[PDB]
Amino acid sequence: MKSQQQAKEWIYKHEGTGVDFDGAYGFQCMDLAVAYVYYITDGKVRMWGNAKDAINNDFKGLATVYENTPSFKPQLGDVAVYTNSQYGHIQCVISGNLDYYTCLEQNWLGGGFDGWEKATIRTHYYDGVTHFIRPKFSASNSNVLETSKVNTFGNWKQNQYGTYYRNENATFTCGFLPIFARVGSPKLSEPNGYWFQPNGYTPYDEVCLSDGLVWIGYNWQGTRYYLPVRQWNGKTGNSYSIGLPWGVFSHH
Amino acid sequence: KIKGQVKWFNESKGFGFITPADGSKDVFVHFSAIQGNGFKTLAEGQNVEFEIQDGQKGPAAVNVTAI
């Protein structure tokens, strides 16, 4: 768990940038909140679903969901959730009082899909928020996510096509959004494949770094497939970094 | 550019798939891709026009219009 200070530095570092780590359709409102909550919980909470679904995720004791009331005082690092629309809206709170609060948010204006609207600081005079998610921040700064097994390079082979690969035997279950699996190679230029559906699962035997993505390699119906499972920053060694996952990994 | 039919659309989740008229791969459609703020839902079997964007997650529909 990171500190409230680290929350503030994360929010300001992401102002004016586009967060699309869930990999789907530009800079959507829930992409920012998913990325924020994943960061401040040191990877323990990967929020699934639409913005209004945030309040029903399992925060594993690392956050408390509060209802907005005329007396509620939001704090830096709260996650504001609007639940009274079809899909909701979500924001990272910077400060607030009883009259208004300020926040970092994506897609307030509807420009996230086409990409011109970045994460923006805005003031809201309680124009729809119904809930606030308050993290249980630690008192001291934490580097746990950046040094975790996930964000350390380790040992990889490279093939003649520039793909990094290694053996790893586990199971992957697809998260909220579907992902297109590619036939034969972990390449976005491969047009053949099939849609891996949410909550679908496969055992896999290979992990690959290619085309800005981490992929799993597996066999289905006699064909070799590669499924992207999170973003990769394209770097190796001590500069290697990968994004929040697009599903859930398990062992059997 | 392309025409197709909505294969299914889960209004609760806000996404579904379109079957393109030319018989290519099904195309993912997210509610944020639907043109017009009054919609944000699509119906099974509905005729649509759209642009195809190739993303990390696969082929996706953009600028989806109900015809």
CSV table of C-alpha atoms in Angstrom, one decimal:
chain,number,residue,atom,x,y,z
A,1,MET,CA,0.0,0.0,0.0
A,2,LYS,CA,1.3,3.4,-0.9
A,3,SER,CA,1.0,6.6,1.1
A,4,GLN,CA,-1.4,9.5,0.6
A,5,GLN,CA,1.6,11.6,-0.4
A,6,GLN,CA,2.4,9.1,-3.2
A,7,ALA,CA,-1.3,9.4,-4.3
A,8,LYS,CA,-0.9,13.1,-4.7
A,9,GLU,CA,2.3,12.8,-6.7
A,10,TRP,CA,0.7,10.1,-8.9
A,11,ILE,CA,-2.3,12.3,-9.7
A,12,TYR,CA,-0.2,15.4,-10.6
A,13,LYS,CA,2.2,13.3,-12.7
A,14,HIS,CA,-0.7,12.0,-14.7
A,15,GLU,CA,-2.3,15.4,-15.3
A,16,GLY,CA,-2.4,16.1,-19.1
A,17,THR,CA,-1.5,12.6,-20.0
A,18,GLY,CA,-3.6,9.8,-21.5
A,19,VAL,CA,-4.1,6.7,-19.4
A,20,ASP,CA,-5.2,3.7,-21.5
A,21,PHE,CA,-3.6,0.8,-19.6
A,22,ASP,CA,-6.8,-1.3,-19.8
A,23,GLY,CA,-5.9,-1.2,-23.5
A,24,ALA,CA,-9.4,-0.4,-24.8
A,25,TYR,CA,-10.4,2.6,-26.8
A,26,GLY,CA,-8.4,5.5,-25.7
A,27,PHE,CA,-8.6,7.5,-22.5
A,28,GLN,CA,-11.7,6.3,-20.8
A,29,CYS,CA,-12.8,7.5,-17.3
A,30,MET,CA,-12.5,4.1,-15.7
A,31,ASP,CA,-9.0,3.5,-17.1
A,32,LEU,CA,-7.7,6.3,-15.0
A,33,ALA,CA,-9.3,5.0,-11.8
A,34,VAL,CA,-8.3,1.4,-12.4
A,35,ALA,CA,-4.7,2.6,-12.9
A,36,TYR,CA,-4.8,4.8,-9.8
A,37,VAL,CA,-6.3,2.1,-7.5
A,38,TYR,CA,-3.9,-0.5,-8.9
A,39,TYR,CA,-0.9,1.8,-8.2
A,40,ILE,CA,-1.9,2.9,-4.7
A,41,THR,CA,-2.7,-0.7,-3.6
A,42,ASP,CA,0.7,-1.8,-4.8
A,43,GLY,CA,-1.0,-4.1,-7.3
A,44,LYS,CA,-3.4,-5.8,-4.9
A,45,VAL,CA,-6.6,-4.3,-6.2
A,46,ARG,CA,-7.4,-4.5,-10.0
A,47,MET,CA,-10.8,-2.9,-10.4
A,48,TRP,CA,-13.1,-4.6,-12.9
A,49,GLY,CA,-16.1,-3.3,-14.8
A,50,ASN,CA,-17.5,0.1,-15.6
A,51,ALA,CA,-17.1,3.2,-13.5
A,52,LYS,CA,-20.4,2.7,-11.6
A,53,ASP,CA,-19.2,-0.9,-10.8
A,54,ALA,CA,-16.2,0.4,-8.9
A,55,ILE,CA,-18.1,0.5,-5.6
A,56,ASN,CA,-18.9,-3.2,-5.9
A,57,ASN,CA,-15.3,-4.4,-6.4
A,58,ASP,CA,-13.4,-6.3,-3.7
A,59,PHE,CA,-11.0,-3.8,-2.1
A,60,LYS,CA,-9.6,-6.5,0.3
A,61,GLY,CA,-9.7,-4.2,3.3
A,62,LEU,CA,-7.6,-1.6,1.5
A,63,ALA,CA,-10.4,0.9,1.0
A,64,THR,CA,-13.8,1.8,2.3
A,65,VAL,CA,-16.8,2.8,0.2
A,66,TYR,CA,-18.6,5.8,1.6
A,67,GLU,CA,-21.9,7.4,0.4
A,68,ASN,CA,-21.9,11.1,-0.4
A,69,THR,CA,-23.9,13.1,2.2
A,70,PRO,CA,-24.2,16.8,2.7
A,71,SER,CA,-21.7,16.4,5.6
A,72,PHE,CA,-19.1,14.2,3.9
A,73,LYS,CA,-15.7,15.7,3.5
A,74,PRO,CA,-13.7,14.3,0.5
A,75,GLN,CA,-10.0,14.0,0.9
A,76,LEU,CA,-7.0,13.8,-1.4
A,77,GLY,CA,-6.8,10.4,-2.9
A,78,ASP,CA,-10.5,9.5,-2.6
A,79,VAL,CA,-12.1,8.0,-5.7
A,80,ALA,CA,-15.4,9.8,-6.6
A,81,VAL,CA,-18.0,7.5,-8.3
A,82,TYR,CA,-21.2,8.6,-10.1
A,83,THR,CA,-23.7,5.8,-10.1
A,84,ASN,CA,-26.8,7.4,-11.5
A,85,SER,CA,-26.2,6.9,-15.2
A,86,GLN,CA,-26.0,3.9,-17.5
A,87,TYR,CA,-22.3,3.3,-17.0
A,88,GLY,CA,-21.3,5.9,-14.4
A,89,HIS,CA,-18.3,8.2,-14.1
A,90,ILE,CA,-15.2,8.1,-11.9
A,91,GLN,CA,-12.6,10.6,-10.8
A,92,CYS,CA,-9.5,10.8,-8.6
A,93,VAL,CA,-10.1,13.4,-5.9
A,94,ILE,CA,-7.5,16.1,-5.2
A,95,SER,CA,-9.3,18.2,-2.6
A,96,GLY,CA,-12.8,19.1,-1.5
A,97,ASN,CA,-15.1,20.8,0.9
A,98,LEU,CA,-18.8,20.8,1.4
A,99,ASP,CA,-19.4,23.1,-1.6
A,100,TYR,CA,-17.2,21.5,-4.3
A,101,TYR,CA,-14.3,19.2,-4.9
A,102,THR,CA,-11.5,19.1,-7.5
A,103,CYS,CA,-10.4,15.9,-9.2
A,104,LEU,CA,-8.4,14.4,-12.0
A,105,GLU,CA,-10.6,12.6,-14.5
A,106,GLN,CA,-10.7,11.3,-18.1
A,107,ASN,CA,-13.6,11.4,-20.6
A,108,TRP,CA,-15.7,14.0,-18.9
A,109,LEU,CA,-16.3,15.7,-22.2
A,110,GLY,CA,-16.4,12.5,-24.3
A,111,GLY,CA,-13.1,13.0,-26.1
A,112,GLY,CA,-11.3,10.0,-24.6
A,113,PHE,CA,-12.1,7.6,-27.4
A,114,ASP,CA,-10.7,9.8,-30.1
A,115,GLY,CA,-7.8,10.8,-27.8
A,116,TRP,CA,-7.9,14.6,-27.7
A,117,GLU,CA,-9.2,14.7,-24.1
A,118,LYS,CA,-6.5,13.8,-21.6
A,119,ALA,CA,-6.6,13.4,-17.8
A,120,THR,CA,-7.8,16.9,-16.7
A,121,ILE,CA,-8.2,18.6,-13.4
A,122,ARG,CA,-11.7,19.9,-13.0
A,123,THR,CA,-14.0,21.3,-10.3
A,124,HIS,CA,-17.4,19.7,-9.6
A,125,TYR,CA,-20.1,21.3,-7.4
A,126,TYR,CA,-21.5,17.9,-6.4
A,127,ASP,CA,-23.1,17.4,-9.9
A,128,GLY,CA,-23.5,13.6,-9.7
A,129,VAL,CA,-21.1,11.9,-7.3
A,130,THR,CA,-22.9,9.4,-5.1
A,131,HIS,CA,-20.0,7.5,-3.5
A,132,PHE,CA,-16.4,8.1,-2.5
A,133,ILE,CA,-13.9,5.3,-2.2
A,134,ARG,CA,-11.3,6.1,0.5
A,135,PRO,CA,-8.1,4.1,0.4
A,136,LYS,CA,-6.5,3.0,3.7
A,137,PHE,CA,-3.1,4.6,2.8
A,138,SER,CA,0.0,3.6,4.6
A,139,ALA,CA,1.9,6.3,6.6
A,140,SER,CA,5.1,5.8,4.7
A,141,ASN,CA,6.1,5.6,1.0
A,142,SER,CA,6.2,2.2,-0.6
A,143,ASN,CA,8.1,0.9,-3.6
A,144,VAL,CA,6.6,-2.6,-3.5
A,145,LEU,CA,4.9,-2.5,-6.9
A,146,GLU,CA,8.0,-1.3,-8.8
A,147,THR,CA,10.2,-4.0,-7.2
A,148,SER,CA,7.7,-6.9,-7.4
A,149,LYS,CA,8.2,-10.1,-9.4
A,150,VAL,CA,5.9,-8.6,-12.1
A,151,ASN,CA,8.0,-5.5,-12.8
A,152,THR,CA,11.4,-7.1,-12.7
A,153,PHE,CA,13.0,-8.3,-16.0
A,154,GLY,CA,14.3,-11.8,-15.1
A,155,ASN,CA,15.6,-14.2,-17.8
A,156,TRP,CA,14.3,-14.2,-21.4
A,157,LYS,CA,15.4,-15.7,-24.7
A,158,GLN,CA,15.0,-13.9,-27.9
A,159,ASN,CA,14.0,-15.4,-31.3
A,160,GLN,CA,15.1,-14.2,-34.7
A,161,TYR,CA,11.9,-12.1,-35.0
A,162,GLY,CA,12.9,-10.0,-31.9
A,163,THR,CA,10.3,-11.6,-29.6
A,164,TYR,CA,11.4,-12.2,-26.0
A,165,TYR,CA,10.0,-15.5,-24.7
A,166,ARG,CA,10.2,-17.7,-21.7
A,167,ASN,CA,8.5,-20.9,-20.4
A,168,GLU,CA,5.8,-20.4,-17.7
A,169,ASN,CA,3.0,-22.9,-17.0
A,170,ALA,CA,-0.1,-21.3,-15.4
A,171,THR,CA,-3.7,-20.4,-16.2
A,172,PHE,CA,-5.1,-17.1,-17.4
A,173,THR,CA,-8.8,-16.1,-16.9
A,174,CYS,CA,-9.9,-13.2,-19.1
A,175,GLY,CA,-11.1,-10.1,-17.2
A,176,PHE,CA,-14.1,-7.8,-17.9
A,177,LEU,CA,-13.3,-7.0,-21.6
A,178,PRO,CA,-12.7,-9.5,-24.4
A,179,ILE,CA,-9.2,-9.9,-26.0
A,180,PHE,CA,-8.4,-11.1,-29.6
A,181,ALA,CA,-6.1,-14.1,-29.6
A,182,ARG,CA,-3.7,-14.3,-32.6
A,183,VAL,CA,-2.8,-17.5,-34.5
A,184,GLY,CA,0.8,-18.6,-34.6
A,185,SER,CA,2.8,-15.6,-33.3
A,186,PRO,CA,2.4,-12.8,-30.7
A,187,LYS,CA,2.1,-10.1,-33.4
A,188,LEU,CA,-0.5,-7.5,-33.9
A,189,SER,CA,0.0,-7.8,-37.6
A,190,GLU,CA,-1.4,-11.3,-37.6
A,191,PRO,CA,-5.1,-11.0,-38.7
A,192,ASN,CA,-6.2,-14.6,-37.9
A,193,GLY,CA,-7.5,-15.5,-34.5
A,194,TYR,CA,-10.6,-15.5,-32.3
A,195,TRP,CA,-12.2,-13.5,-29.6
A,196,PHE,CA,-11.3,-14.7,-26.1
A,197,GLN,CA,-14.3,-13.9,-24.0
A,198,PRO,CA,-14.5,-12.4,-20.5
A,199,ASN,CA,-14.2,-15.1,-17.8
A,200,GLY,CA,-12.9,-17.5,-20.4
A,201,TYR,CA,-9.8,-19.3,-19.3
A,202,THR,CA,-6.9,-21.3,-20.7
A,203,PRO,CA,-3.7,-23.0,-19.4
A,204,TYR,CA,-0.7,-21.5,-21.1
A,205,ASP,CA,2.9,-22.6,-21.4
A,206,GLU,CA,4.8,-19.5,-22.7
A,207,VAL,CA,5.1,-15.8,-22.0
A,208,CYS,CA,6.3,-13.3,-24.7
A,209,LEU,CA,7.2,-9.7,-25.0
A,210,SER,CA,6.3,-8.3,-28.4
A,211,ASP,CA,4.7,-5.3,-30.0
A,212,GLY,CA,4.3,-3.3,-26.7
A,213,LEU,CA,2.5,-6.2,-25.1
A,214,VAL,CA,3.0,-9.2,-22.8
A,215,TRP,CA,1.5,-12.3,-24.3
A,216,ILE,CA,0.7,-15.8,-23.3
A,217,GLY,CA,1.2,-18.7,-25.6
A,218,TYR,CA,-1.0,-21.8,-25.5
A,219,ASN,CA,-2.6,-24.5,-27.7
A,220,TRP,CA,-6.3,-24.8,-28.5
A,221,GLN,CA,-7.8,-27.3,-30.9
A,222,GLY,CA,-4.4,-28.2,-32.3
A,223,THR,CA,-3.5,-24.5,-33.1
A,224,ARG,CA,-0.9,-22.3,-31.4
A,225,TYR,CA,-2.3,-19.0,-30.1
A,226,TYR,CA,-0.9,-15.9,-28.5
A,227,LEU,CA,-3.1,-13.7,-26.3
A,228,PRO,CA,-2.0,-10.3,-25.1
A,229,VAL,CA,-2.5,-10.0,-21.3
A,230,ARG,CA,-1.1,-6.5,-20.5
A,231,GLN,CA,1.0,-3.7,-21.9
A,232,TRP,CA,4.8,-3.7,-21.9
A,233,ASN,CA,6.8,-0.5,-22.2
A,234,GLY,CA,9.1,-2.1,-24.8
A,235,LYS,CA,12.2,-2.0,-22.7
A,236,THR,CA,14.4,-4.7,-21.2
A,237,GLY,CA,16.7,-5.0,-18.2
A,238,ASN,CA,16.3,-2.6,-15.3
A,239,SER,CA,14.1,-0.3,-17.5
A,240,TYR,CA,11.5,-3.1,-18.0
A,241,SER,CA,7.9,-2.3,-16.9
A,242,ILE,CA,4.6,-3.9,-17.6
A,243,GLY,CA,1.1,-2.6,-17.0
A,244,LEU,CA,-1.9,-3.7,-15.0
A,245,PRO,CA,-3.2,-7.1,-16.1
A,246,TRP,CA,-6.2,-7.7,-18.5
A,247,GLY,CA,-7.2,-10.8,-16.5
A,248,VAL,CA,-6.4,-13.0,-13.5
A,249,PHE,CA,-3.5,-15.5,-13.3
A,250,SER,CA,-3.8,-18.8,-11.3
A,251,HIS,CA,-2.0,-22.1,-10.8
A,252,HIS,CA,-3.5,-25.7,-10.8
B,1,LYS,CA,-16.6,2.6,-44.5
B,2,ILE,CA,-17.9,-0.9,-43.5
B,3,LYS,CA,-21.5,-2.1,-42.9
B,4,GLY,CA,-22.5,-4.9,-40.6
B,5,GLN,CA,-25.0,-6.3,-38.2
B,6,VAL,CA,-24.8,-6.2,-34.4
B,7,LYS,CA,-24.2,-9.8,-33.3
B,8,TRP,CA,-25.0,-9.1,-29.7
B,9,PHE,CA,-24.7,-6.2,-27.3
B,10,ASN,CA,-24.8,-6.4,-23.5
B,11,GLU,CA,-26.3,-3.1,-22.4
B,12,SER,CA,-25.3,-3.7,-18.8
B,13,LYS,CA,-21.7,-4.2,-19.7
B,14,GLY,CA,-21.7,-1.6,-22.5
B,15,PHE,CA,-20.0,-3.7,-25.2
B,16,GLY,CA,-20.7,-6.3,-27.8
B,17,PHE,CA,-19.7,-7.4,-31.3
B,18,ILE,CA,-20.6,-6.6,-34.9
B,19,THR,CA,-20.5,-9.0,-37.8
B,20,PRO,CA,-19.2,-7.2,-40.8
B,21,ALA,CA,-21.1,-7.5,-44.1
B,22,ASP,CA,-17.9,-8.7,-45.9
B,23,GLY,CA,-17.6,-11.7,-43.7
B,24,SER,CA,-14.4,-10.7,-42.0
B,25,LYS,CA,-13.6,-11.1,-38.2
B,26,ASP,CA,-16.2,-10.0,-35.7
B,27,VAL,CA,-15.4,-6.5,-34.5
B,28,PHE,CA,-15.6,-5.4,-30.9
B,29,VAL,CA,-17.9,-2.5,-30.1
B,30,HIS,CA,-17.7,-0.5,-26.9
B,31,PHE,CA,-20.4,2.0,-25.8
B,32,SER,CA,-17.9,4.9,-26.2
B,33,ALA,CA,-17.7,4.1,-29.9
B,34,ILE,CA,-21.4,4.7,-30.6
B,35,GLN,CA,-22.1,8.0,-32.4
B,36,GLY,CA,-24.6,10.2,-30.7
B,37,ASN,CA,-25.0,10.7,-27.0
B,38,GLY,CA,-28.7,9.6,-27.0
B,39,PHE,CA,-27.8,6.0,-27.9
B,40,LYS,CA,-24.9,4.3,-26.0
B,41,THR,CA,-26.8,1.0,-26.5
B,42,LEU,CA,-27.2,-1.2,-29.6
B,43,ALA,CA,-29.6,-3.9,-30.4
B,44,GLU,CA,-29.0,-7.5,-31.6
B,45,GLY,CA,-29.4,-7.7,-35.4
B,46,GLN,CA,-29.3,-3.9,-35.8
B,47,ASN,CA,-27.8,-2.7,-39.1
B,48,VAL,CA,-24.8,-0.4,-38.5
B,49,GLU,CA,-22.0,1.5,-40.3
B,50,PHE,CA,-18.6,2.0,-38.7
B,51,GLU,CA,-14.9,2.4,-39.2
B,52,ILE,CA,-12.6,-0.4,-38.0
B,53,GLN,CA,-9.7,0.5,-35.7
B,54,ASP,CA,-7.1,-2.2,-35.1
B,55,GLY,CA,-6.1,-2.0,-31.4
B,56,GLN,CA,-4.0,-4.0,-29.0
B,57,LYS,CA,-7.0,-6.0,-28.0
B,58,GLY,CA,-8.2,-6.7,-31.5
B,59,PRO,CA,-10.3,-5.1,-34.2
B,60,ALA,CA,-12.7,-2.5,-32.8
B,61,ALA,CA,-15.5,-0.5,-34.2
B,62,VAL,CA,-15.5,3.3,-34.2
B,63,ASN,CA,-18.0,6.0,-35.1
B,64,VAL,CA,-20.9,3.4,-35.1
B,65,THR,CA,-24.1,4.7,-36.7
B,66,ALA,CA,-27.5,3.0,-36.7
B,67,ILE,CA,-28.9,2.7,-40.3
